[PDB]
């Protein structure tokens, strides 16, 4: 019993590690696999699900499947699996010699929370466990007490207004425009180009051109009227097969959904508009400390250039007698578990675990209350 | 109950031998030759059928006759016939002592796999019997879990890709191009030098002149601008009457025929573009793997310089950013017999046979669900 | 300048006529063959090609293609030469006498429609052309403004969710499982039978195998253990050379694939899955009334006992408290034509034209911002 | 230059007119004799070589000898021998002064066409030639584009499938039983009658023993036992020297040699199984056009009933469901020559000559790319 595991489990990739360190032990996507073809060989029963870093190799012969949809987690007999696979084959720790600290999106069902609680004592026997909130844990990555944060990962964008210390519930604005709705966007640009990518196995390498040829565009029509003289902006890509794709036009429009989500028509408003209307709704006098720390995280403030469109936009929104300033940290992507790694490195936390002992005489609505 | 019998029934040449050993011990053709002339000596009913290696010593006399027409076997009086010469002519052993590994070609009929087995049960009572697919049975030889299979035997060519394990059987690209319909056109182009090889006698003189002086071109137009200055490629072959024939340039354009089907008319492609689109049915995924691992087998690929022309010729189809390695072993001819000698002598496999009482209470459709 | 031309373009058939009319006037597939034989007549240059009826006829001799894959016209010299035949050959009329409505698919790339646009201006010389939808057009045969059109062409099968005037393009599940991909696995489970239709010639024999004596099952495992009793099922065809095939469980397990993709290997779900997985895309308000107009079209929808499988199986996916009509008009086949008949002749329509004179000074893009 | 020389020199019979006429100036065998007695009278270098009608009165005294041998000319010293006394003596036109149109058989060697074509220039010196085939001209005798050939002449008897102006060369299924080799089989059954007809000069009067008493059997048993009460089919010949013989059941059993080829032991089938194997091996859509048009030519196919067995034996083998017509014109002897007469006296041949001048740039491998 020297340090705790913190096992961030997000919508489309596992982070874990442990509680101390700076860079995460554990980078693999959340994918369970199933093989689809007939399988001649001698290996009969020889590995019928491949979880993580398998099912990307192989991922040519399986059927893969994202357990969780939007944070929230719909088959249970997978998320045990990748959980296996964390500990044992990936760690290389038991479970029942560390706490963990799982973390979860806000806003998720009452069932969520619950369920997750009765797996890691019903199966894996851990000492004591804690369910954070992604949003809270980006601020001590940061390290501030004061902001709104665009959590904006794979499965679900959300603001969450924070003030020196006091959360802002009734001030939420969740979205369900994220990364795995920007590749599907994706697929559907690409189309146009005459390039078909369909299936699961071609959906993760959409996923690869999203996450190294598409950027922002600071301003968009002039960028769209720059795609007329298609001979500057054309980046080409070399395909896993040998093929070259010549991609134009779809490297600003797909980043651009999460500005304008009537593209892939949604009746709300983009990541610029939901966080303007999530501080016009926390009280006048904090109005002017959130201007000023706008905390990103999440894969999807990864791309080029987000950080401008941002702080041009909620200007042109925001009375202009003061200052916008995004506070985009450069490691931004792991932020979510870098507050994670400091939270359970805390004298003030040890105390605020739940055990299996005060789970047993109060029961699954004991994690409810903790501190929401 | 020690060992297995491996009888590769092939469609022009019966491999048969024992589970464990490096070279059969049964190499003759699938030959089942009627005498038609008188007859006049006192021997009236003496050897009325020869079979094997006795129809090729008297085939002068002899109206031969191959029993498999593209891997179907059109006449079951005489495939009878041979196995009851394979087991206790030459390998000289009781079939009701050893199980058997019966090969066929895939894409076969369902009715030729179950009359398969109606004989080896109901006529020779062997114990147990499975039967496997040739093309599987290459990668066993090599060595190799991932490729795809180039199996020109002598009654069909047939392309199967087979990744880590999981055969894909949506994109086997049948070709009934074969050795025999090489000899076929080797005694067309024959008449034109005047030679006239007609009777199945002499289709067995073109047959050992195709397996001796017949090369395959790198490039075809150059060596047949060659053959203008006809005095450097003329070889020589002497036919068992003590005749000379000087072939040409028909050393070269009947193992073209495999590259070019439109000399026979055919209305389909070579084996450089039934193996290029054969993989381009593969998964994106997988098709890095497969032109890596391009496995050859069958008789039809021991002509000199074929793995030149592949690699030469799937190279112009490819995409040009990428290599392929076509894996031609220097014993390949009997590769399908080498993995069915290795995969008889597994452990995971002794439980894999189909009994005889298993048969009885099951039926014949027993053997069609065995692994596809 | 009285009527206008309707050239539906379909990806294995052509349908030409004029609008007004209830049937057109030209039904003839999309062939463009090349003689491949030595041809020793004195016709040497005598019709190099053979277009659409002619290549019907004279298909033993021909090298049949079709230059349409997937809505995707691969090859424009042959896409070129097909309209010169339907034009002057088939209808009788000049192109500059009359405005032509061309369809196509949705979700084509747009390269597609600027260069049919190109071809109808700068070759034919037309008065004015509109690129319509033929999803669009299913509705106006149907007489309907609502309701998800299931269009299993021959190249391509969409479902396209339409309310009552306004298209949800954020919800169009294209799938490219079609009329052309039933006939390659037909001829891959007629090999069983031991009957090898191979090449393009016989390629027109599977399809008319498939027109006639092909159905769909309403539950697919008891008609399977019917065939297990293999009296009752086995139809006869006659073949154009006069043999006979008897052909049992392969009348429906062809259009089986249709709803299990994974016979021929594609990772995606059948048509009762893209049509439900197409309504739970679109608007929660909006899902009563797609449900109770389901308007199917396409050849591929003139099964027998289709209305049947779709009404039986998505009725298992919705909420069982409501109602599922599938809406299948007996003149499906030409339903898209049928609505391009109507909207030609529309009063509402005569302005929604092409002109020359506009395509020259706005370019080619003219045409993609026409109701998109 | 007005008309064209016609040159059919068959394998046993050289016929030879001009372009126009239906019938040729010129009937007359193949026969270059050489006397083999002492000669005492003053004539000693008096006509030392008798050609053709010549060499047909004074037989008795000469060793005939056909130059010809199926088809492939053995000694070309006599058939210059040939073509000077029938340009010359029979024709009575100069060589100089027409073109000429040579026929021969199909698979014939390459070095046979070339041979030709060196002495027509180098020798005769006409001003064009072409080198036609034979059975492709049966098809313009008889006003057709469509059918196979049974062209069994008196060297040679080839099935040639012709579709609709283009022929398939990798069908021609080749026979060397004919005319001349049922002249031999019939010398061999008239020794168990007692006559012994052995040399040359004999071997003329077995040919037309052969042309006169010898029909074909529609049922070969009930003909057979016919003979038992030999009294109403032995028919009587009258020889040159006044005797008789009373030939009986060797009146059918000599042309049933065309139909069973094991009688004069070739390993092969009849004239109607390389009927019918040259449609099985021709494609399917053009299989059905194939049995309704079966022309016949050639002299062996002159006898009584032949058009009766042929209709009666492929019916036997064809599916039975539709018709086979045995196209049989009652001057189908000459045909090879009218359809000579007819293709050189159109206007699309008329640039289809090979002249001298193109001969002498191209050389000898310009004769064989003309049509194949
Ligand atoms: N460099 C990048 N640029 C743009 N998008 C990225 C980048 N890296 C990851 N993404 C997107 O973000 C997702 C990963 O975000 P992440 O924060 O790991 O999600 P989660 O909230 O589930 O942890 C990926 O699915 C990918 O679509
Ligand atoms: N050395 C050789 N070179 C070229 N072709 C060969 C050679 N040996 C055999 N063949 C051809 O390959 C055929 C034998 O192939 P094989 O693999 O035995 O066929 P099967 O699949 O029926 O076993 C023979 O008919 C012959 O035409
Ligand atoms: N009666 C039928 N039953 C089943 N399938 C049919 C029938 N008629 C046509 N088809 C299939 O539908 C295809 C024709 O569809 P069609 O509507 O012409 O496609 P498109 O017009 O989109 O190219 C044919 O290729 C055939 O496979
Ligand atoms: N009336 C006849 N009946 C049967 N056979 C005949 C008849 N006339 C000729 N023949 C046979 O046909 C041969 C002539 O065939 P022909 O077509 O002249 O040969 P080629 O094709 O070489 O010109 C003769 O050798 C003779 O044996
Ligand atoms: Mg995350
Ligand atoms: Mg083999
Ligand atoms: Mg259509
Ligand atoms: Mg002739």
Same mark, same amino acid.
């Given at each position: 019993e020297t340090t705790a595991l913190v096992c961030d489990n997000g919508s489309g990739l596992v982070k874990a590690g442990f509680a101390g360190d700076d860079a995460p032990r554990a980078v693999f996507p959340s994918i369970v696999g199933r093989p689809r073809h007939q399988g001649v060989m001698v290996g009969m029963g020889q590995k019928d699900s491949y979880v993580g870093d398998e099912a990307q190799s192989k991922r040519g012969i399986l059927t893969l499947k994202y357990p969780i949809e939007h944070g929230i987690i719909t088959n249970w007999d997978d998320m045990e699996k990748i959980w296996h696979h964390t500990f044992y084959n990936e760690l290389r720790?038991?479970?029942?010699? %560390?706490?963990?600290? =799982? +973390?979860?999106?806000?806003?998720?069902?009452?069932?969520?929370?619950?369920?997750? +609680?009765?797996?890691?004592?019903?199966?894996?026997?851990?000492?004591?466990?804690?369910?954070? &909130?992604?949003?809270?844990?980006?601020?001590?990555?940061? !390290?501030?007490? *004061? !902001? $709104?944060? =665009?959590?904006?990962?794979?499965?679900?964008? %959300?603001?969450?207004? &924070?003030?020196?210390?006091?959360?802002?519930? %009734?001030? $939420?604005?969740?979205?369900?425009?994220?990364?795995?709705? =920007?590749?599907?966007?994706?697929?559907?640009?690409? +189309?146009?180009? !005459? #390039?078909?990518?369909?299936? +699961?196995?071609?959906?993760? $390498?959409?996923?690869? &051109?999203?996450?190294?040829?598409? #950027?922002?565009? =600071?301003?968009?029509?002039?960028?769209?009227? *720059?795609?007329?003289?298609?001979?500057?902006?054309?980046?080409?890509?070399?395909?896993?097969? !040998?093929?070259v794709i010549t991609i134009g036009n779809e490297r600003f429009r797909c980043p651009e959904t999460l500005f304008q989500p009537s593209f892939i028509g949604m009746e709300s408003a983009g990541i610029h508009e939901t966080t303007y209307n999530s501080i016009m709704k926390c009280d006048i006098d904090i109005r002017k400390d959130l201007y000023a720390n706008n905390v990103m995280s999440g894969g999807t403030t990864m791309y080029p250039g987000i950080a401008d469109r941002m702080q041009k936009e909620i200007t042109a929104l925001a009375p202009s007698t003061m200052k916008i300033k995004i506070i985009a940290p450069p490691e931004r992507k792991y932020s979510v578990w870098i507050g994670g790694s400091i939270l359970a490195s805390l004298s003030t936390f040890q105390q605020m675990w739940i055990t299996k002992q005060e789970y047993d005489e109060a029961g699954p609505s004991i994690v409810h209350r903790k501190c929401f």
């Open positions: 720790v038991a479970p029942e010699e %560390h706490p963990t600290l =799982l +973390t979860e999106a806000p806003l998720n069902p009452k069932a969520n929370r619950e369920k997750m +609680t009765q797996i890691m004592f019903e199966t894996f026997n851990v000492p004591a466990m804690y369910v954070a &909130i992604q949003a809270v844990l980006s601020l001590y990555a940061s !390290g501030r007490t *004061t !902001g $709104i944060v =665009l959590d904006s990962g794979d499965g679900v964008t %959300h603001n969450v207004p &924070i003030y020196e210390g006091y959360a802002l519930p %009734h001030a $939420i604005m969740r979205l369900d425009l994220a990364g795995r709705d =920007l590749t599907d966007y994706l697929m559907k640009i690409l +189309t146009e180009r !005459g #390039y078909s990518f369909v299936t +699961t196995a071609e959906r993760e $390498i959409v996923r690869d &051109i999203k996450e190294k040829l598409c #950027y922002v565009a =600071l301003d968009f029509e002039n960028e769209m009227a *720059t795609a007329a003289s298609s001979s500057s902006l054309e980046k080409s890509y070399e395909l896993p097969d !040998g093929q």
